[PDB]
Amino acid sequence: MKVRDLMDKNFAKIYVDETVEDAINLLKKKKRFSAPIVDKEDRLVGWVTTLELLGISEKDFKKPITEFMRPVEEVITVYEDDEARNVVLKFVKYKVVSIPVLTRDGRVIGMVRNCDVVKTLAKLYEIPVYKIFKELHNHIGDISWEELMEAAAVVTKRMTGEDITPQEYEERIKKTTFGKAIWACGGLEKFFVGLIEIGMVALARKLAKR
Amino acid sequence: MKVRDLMDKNFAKIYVDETVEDAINLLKKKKRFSAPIVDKEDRLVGWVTTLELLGISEKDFKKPITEFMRPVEEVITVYEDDEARNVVLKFVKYKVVSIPVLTRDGRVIGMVRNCDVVKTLAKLYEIPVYKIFKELHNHIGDISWEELMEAAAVVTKRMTGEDITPQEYEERIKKTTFGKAIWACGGLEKFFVGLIEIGMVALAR
């Protein structure tokens, strides 16, 4: 999954020539706690949080925002076409509250906060296992959907000893969400390896005939 | 997993009698963007974020924090024994910046933010590929560990041309993490079909 599918596009875009008062007004209008500072060409030159702006005297509201920003050299960034897990590892390692998103041209086009990642996770939780088995089916090869369902029935008969027909399994994965299946398998690892075993049994059964 | 496993006990707690200056200094010291306002018994009296204190005058630095806080009715809370999915759903639904963790009698004992959920997610990417291969070995059956390692070597010599021994691959997956593995395979799908092919070669031999 790409970063551009998680990112916040309603971010406060501060320009390098603006004052502290301008930045405060934009941050309060946009309901954001951090913001990138860009130039006229929308290229990143800085980054600021509302923490560094607290306690400022009103006589200093006319100071340029460049006197309170982090220069771009010290700013954690990510590209729009990177994989989604990259921003996760960066979030955990560097503990920054937001990460600007750049095009493959150097321009700021979004922001990623932890809440965007959490939103995406909440969306993945509710995906039916049916979708996971379709995306799985795209990579197995010359295996039919019925053969895959049969293999999944064999695997469940090996795991839990339950005798189930392929159609009942299809209905079951249509009714089961991703997170509930992860919880049933006992973790994302055992679910992943379970899918591996299902694919393996499928390909083996296909080789047993030809 | 419970809120117990997600919550942080080190947070910024502001008392109802403190001033705006104290709240600003505490938010800066704790590096937090929001905080609850509690009474003498640590019970919820309000909440505040940096945006409520942003752009105010130097005169307001001595006013009580009650002049800028927000009403309790806007605060979404959780209990320590609530499910983690519940605080996730409350994060997504109410789009709030932080969620306090209360006792059954209303005392503020914890704080949950989105970055705690993210931090617990990241643990998945630190798993060594060795353990994934262990679970796979438990799911294969007739193949032994040495045979599975030999198969992995045969496959790596095919995909990349590297002449690697089973022990070298053992140390390799012992010292490479799941995140670096799916990064080096070009995506989760190719790591997945790689494991499938390794198991297949192991079964054929």
Curated annotation (Swiss-Prot), chain A:
Record bears the keyword Repeat: yes
Entry superkingdom: Archaea
Residue ranges of domain CBS in the record: 7-65, 69-129
Pfam families: CBS
SMART domains: CBS
SUPFAM superfamilies named among the record's database cross-references: CBS-domain pair (SSF54631)
Species for this entry: Methanocaldococcus jannaschii (strain ATCC 43067 / DSM 2661 / JAL-1 / JCM 10045 / NBRC 100440) (Methanococcus jannaschii)
Keyword Repeat: yes
Keyword terms of this UniProt record: CBS domain, Repeat
Protein name as it appears in the record: Uncharacterized protein MJ1004
